[PDB]
Amino acid sequence: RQILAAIFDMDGLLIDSEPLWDRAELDVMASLGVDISRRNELPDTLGLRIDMVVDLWYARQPWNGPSRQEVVERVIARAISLVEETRPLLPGVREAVALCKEQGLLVGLASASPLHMLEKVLTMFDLRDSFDALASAEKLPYSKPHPQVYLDCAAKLGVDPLTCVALEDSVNGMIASKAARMRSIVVPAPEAQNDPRFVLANVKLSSLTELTAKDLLG
Amino acid sequence: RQILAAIFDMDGLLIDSEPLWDRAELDVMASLGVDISRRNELPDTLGLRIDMVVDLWYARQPWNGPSRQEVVERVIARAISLVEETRPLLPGVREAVALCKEQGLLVGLASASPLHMLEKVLTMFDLRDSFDALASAEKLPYSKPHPQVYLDCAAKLGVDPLTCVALEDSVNGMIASKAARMRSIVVPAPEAQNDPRFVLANVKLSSLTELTAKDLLG
Numbered sequence: 001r002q003i004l005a006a007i008f009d010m011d012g013l014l015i016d017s018e019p020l021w022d023r024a025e026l027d028v029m030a031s032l033g034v035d036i037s038r039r040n041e042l043p044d045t046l047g048l049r050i051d052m053v054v055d056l057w058y059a060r061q062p063w064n065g066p067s068r069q070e071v072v073e074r075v076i077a078r079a080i081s082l083v084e085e086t087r088p089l090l091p092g093v094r095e096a097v098a099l100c101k102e103q104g105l106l107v108g109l110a111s112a113s114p115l116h117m118l119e120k121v122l123t124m125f126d127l128r129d130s131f132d133a134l135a136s137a138e139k140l141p142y143s144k145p146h147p148q149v150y151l152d153c154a155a156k157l158g159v160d161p162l163t164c165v166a167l168e169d170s171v172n173g174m175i176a177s178k179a180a181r182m183r184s185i186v187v188p189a190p191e192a193q194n195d196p197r198f199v200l201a202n203v204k205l206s207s208l209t210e211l212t213a214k215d216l217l218g
Numbered sequence: 219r220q221i222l223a224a225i226f227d228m229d230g231l232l233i234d235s236e237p238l239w240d241r242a243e244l245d246v247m248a249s250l251g252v253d254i255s256r257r258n259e260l261p262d263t264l265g266l267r268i269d270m271v272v273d274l275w276y277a278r279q280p281w282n283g284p285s286r287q288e289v290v291e292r293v294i295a296r297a298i299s300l301v302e303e304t305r306p307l308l309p310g311v312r313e314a315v316a317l318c319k320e321q322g323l324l325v326g327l328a329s330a331s332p333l334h335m336l337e338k339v340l341t342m343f344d345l346r347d348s349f350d351a352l353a354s355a356e357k358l359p360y361s362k363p364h365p366q367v368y369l370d371c372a373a374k375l376g377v378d379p380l381t382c383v384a385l386e387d388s389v390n391g392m393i394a395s396k397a398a399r400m401r402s403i404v405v406p407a408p409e410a411q412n413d414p415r416f417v418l419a420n421v422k423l424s425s426l427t428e429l430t431a432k433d434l435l436g
């Protein structure tokens with residue numbers, strides 16, 4: 001398999017945003033009167049688009065006032081403010097992106113988060129220039145684990161999805177890359193460390209600091 | 219997870235057609251002058267749509283005369299004749315489908331094979347009446363492991379994909395069902411035995427004769 005491009009996941013892979021999304025969700029849900037202690041009633045939501053999480057909450061504990069979409073955009077805005085404020089770049093990111101270029105690869109971003117947030121996070125770490133294409137799953141009918149966002153990214157990159165390696169922190173994200181028939185590297189979130197399903201990935205890293213050219217190219 | 223429907227894979231799951239497809243591909247490729255001994259050069263193609271397989275051969279050893287699409291149609295026609303001839307219903311099928319109905323489920327079919335072939339195989343085993351919906355990936359941009367065919371089946375059935383259990387014999391088919399966010403039961407092909415990636419399935423059966431109500435509903 002000939003690798004021409006590397007596509008990075010964003011939340012929990014490039015940035016330590018999972019705690020920040022949690023906080024944004026918590027704060028907004030609490031403001032609506034939603035009983036948060038019942039968080040255990042929801043399925044695992046790691047890697048799921050925010051709209052799916054808000055829908056899950058709304059199915060357990062409906063609320064009045066703002067619609068689910070209005071709640072989605074409040075959570076998004078809050079998560080973004082938290083990201084700007086803390087600048088949570090994960091270890092090894094800068095080096096990993098550089099390595100991709102050193103190894104002759106195009107570089108993409110494929111995320112469930114809105115395109116404006118993708119642009120914002122990359123620009124804030126002076127990484128926008130290194131990314132040849134960005135793809136958001138926001139407007140799409142289905143986000144990860146549906147492969148559409150990854151296929152869109154490959155198309156914007158101008159390469160066959162088969163020539164891509166996707167770096168992910170979640171099972172849902174990994175499945176999206178495999179449903180697109182891509183090579184997969186995972187750097188599992190702390191919340192997912194010993195998930196047996198990561199056996200589907202081609203490479204498993206404890207951190208992006210450990211990333212090598214062999215991991216990328218096979 | 220409340221299960222409302224069961225969607226069966228076709229080839230290798232309901233019918234023992236994988237060896238018949240092999241024979242159809244072999245015979246057609248041999249007629250084109252294609253050096254069959256180099257079959258080892260292709261990747262694992264289990265569960266891939268025939269067009270992808272023809273493209274894989276054509277990339278290695280491009281022939282003249284019939285186009286890839288003309289070759290696809292020739293292989294399909296040969297495969298169908300072989301199925302009609304041998305009528306290779308796999309063990310436990312009729313009982314599995316009956317079990318689904320006894321457990322209150324709608325029944326779907328989702329396959330990479332052409333719709334006309336799906337109608338033919340079902341009608342040939344007096345199973346067409348038991349199936350509430352059929353979905354073929356033949357006309358789609360991407361077949362399994364892309365989830366589109368499974369999502370189309372769920373839509374034709376009239377249920378949320380989250381309420382579906384997909385029965386598959388391949389990793390590629392399983393990934394498609396998991397990319398659609400469905401429950402997964404696998405009855406691994408003889409070729410795919412011991413594939414570690416079946417750990418993603420919710421249930422793994424050695425045969426459909428082993429299918430129980432608990433496997434379907436969880």
Ligand SMILES: [Ca+2]
Pocket residue numbers: 009010011012013047168169170173
């Ligand atoms: Ca992620």
Ligand SMILES: [Ca+2]
Pocket residue numbers: 101102103104
């Ligand atoms: Ca170089």
Ligand SMILES: [Ca+2]
Pocket residue numbers: 126127128129130
């Ligand atoms: Ca830069």
Ligand SMILES: [Ca+2]
Pocket residue numbers: 227228229230231265386387388391
């Ligand atoms: Ca199959």
